[PDB]
């Protein structure tokens, strides 16, 4: 099929990875207590 | 302690799913041409 020209590559740099993992892990450390209740 | 027995899976998926999303995006970023 004729290719779609609206396609764009996606990126996540290392600093962004680290920031995201920090956000997620710290959120988990915060909410886990409430999930266990 | 009488904790919620679903707290473990809730926490585990809460950590793992977005963490995995991010690792997928990072790694596929690194492997792109320099």
């Amino acid at each position: 099929m004729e290719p779609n020209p609206n396609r764009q590559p996606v990126e996540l740099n290392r600093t962004s990875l680290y920031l995201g993992l920090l956000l997620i892990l710290v959120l988990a450390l915060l909410f886990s207590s409430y999930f266990f209740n | 302690m009488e904790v919620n027995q679903l707290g473990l899976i809730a926490t585990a998926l809460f950590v793992l799913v977005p963490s995995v999303f991010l690792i997928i995006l990072y790694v596929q970023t690194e492997s792109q041409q320099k």
Partner: peptide, 30 residues
Amino acid sequence: METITYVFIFACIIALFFFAIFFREPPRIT
């Protein structure tokens, strides 16, 4: 199992500190 979870998450965070510091993408002047 709760304790295991909490300590696990904490340890993951500390390891994350380690990688974020010593294995960061280096800042480069262009």
